[PDB]
Amino acid sequence: DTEAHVPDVYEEVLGVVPITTLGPRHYCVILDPMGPDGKNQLGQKRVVKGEKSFFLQPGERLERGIQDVYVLSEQQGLLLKALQPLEEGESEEKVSHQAGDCWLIRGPLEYVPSAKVEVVEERQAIPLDQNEGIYVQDVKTGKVRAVIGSTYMLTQDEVLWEKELPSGVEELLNSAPRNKTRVVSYRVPHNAAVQVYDYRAKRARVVFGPELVTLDPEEQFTVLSLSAGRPKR
Amino acid sequence: DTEAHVPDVYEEVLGVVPITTLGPRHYCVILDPMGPDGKNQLGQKRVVKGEKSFFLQPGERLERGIQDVYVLSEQQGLLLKALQPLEEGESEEKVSHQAGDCWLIRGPLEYVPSAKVEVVEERQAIPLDQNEGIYVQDVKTGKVRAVIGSTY
Amino acid sequence: VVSYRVPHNAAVQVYDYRAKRARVVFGPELVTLDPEEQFTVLSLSAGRPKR
């Protein structure tokens, strides 16, 4: 229709404008969304995602206005998400997560956060040179390892792990704030050797030659207090 | 209905807002929660979880407003709780607990403290390197040991 | 847990007091002290004239 207001002195509340969602990239959450009862589901929430013309029924509101679909950072773009309530085979994974048991989805997909899922970290995978790396610690295991060589994204249970020696920082930068999670590595000069001891593994290693060494999570550089002066201090 | 006020000069106390609890995460405790009597259960307390529209009956009141369901810190998020009165097979574990005899539930689960329970510690497990740890003391034993290697 | 990187050419002495376990740890390895055990300490001479 296009019907006359005050059909019998009735309150025009407003002319409501239809929220419309951009096919190729738009979604949203409506709160108090009415199911069959024609009346609001007060606590609940509904996500709608495609191209749609949408009228917010009375007592519906939009949670976060008009959010656009996550389309990942791709080769390396990551979302990490917990889950408010328990739910199985519900997400676009058709796999079971227990309430809270958070996880990550990455790769070449577009994501709409499910009703029951919450986007924790918008993770970004770190590009790594053939010969450089980062330390990760497994929150779950406690396991602190060095990931070196290729670019990496930290698995759901991982996070970056820092370290450094009390003076070694200076002979290394031989400054910008030294990044404590980037794998410590040092170019051993042509006619030199450096003595490294792994402390967690109890692996001694003396690396000679012109090669570079990189220190595994626990291992330390041996330092040397050498004399030098014209009068030799 | 939508009934006319003062049906025969009667006192409206107020319009009561329908306290509503969020399905995925909200719960709460009502105090003086009237049961079958149609009349308040004065000393007591009713817990209510899940999605619900609620109208607090006259002489009800929410103990702690509109609290939200615990869902743990997960691989490593912990809740330690004591109990007011004794209760057996009453926990969601269907496990017997003696009054006071406090205990913890951790892991990947969402929790609502039972009417007869109270959340002692919101414990959080410590991440520990392959080669470092902490000293825990067993209050029961008095035993003090070294817990080293993993997260605890 | 108290731990200590024993330097390459050193050894530290530790005694466990609760268990009565003596231990001298050599090498470049690191020691971590159990609840009761203690580091033997040393009061050494140092100066040019040797205090």
UniProtKB/Swiss-Prot annotation, chain A:
Signal peptide: none annotated. Coiled coil: none annotated. Disulfide bonds: none annotated. It is found in: Cytoplasm; Nucleus. MVP repeats lie at residues 19-69, 70-125, 126-183, 184-233. The vault ribonucleoprotein particle is a huge (400 A x 670 A) cage structure of 12.9 MDa. It consists of a dimer of half-vaults, with each half-vault comprising 39 identical major vault protein (MVP) chains, PARP4 and one or more vault RNAs (vRNAs). Interacts with TEP1. Interacts with PTEN and activated MAPK1. The phosphorylated protein interacts with the SH2 domains of PTPN11 and SRC. Interacts with APEX1. May interact with ZNF540. MVP 3 mediates interaction with PTEN. Required for normal vault structure. Vaults are multi-subunit structures that may act as scaffolds for proteins involved in signal transduction. Vaults may also play a role in nucleo-cytoplasmic transport. Down-regulates IFNG-mediated STAT1 signaling and subsequent activation of JAK. Down-regulates SRC activity and signaling through MAP kinases. This is Major vault protein. It comes from Rattus norvegicus (Rat). The lineage of its organism: Eukaryota, Metazoa, Chordata, Craniata, Vertebrata. The gene is Mvp. The chain holds residues 255 to 507 of 861 of the full protein.
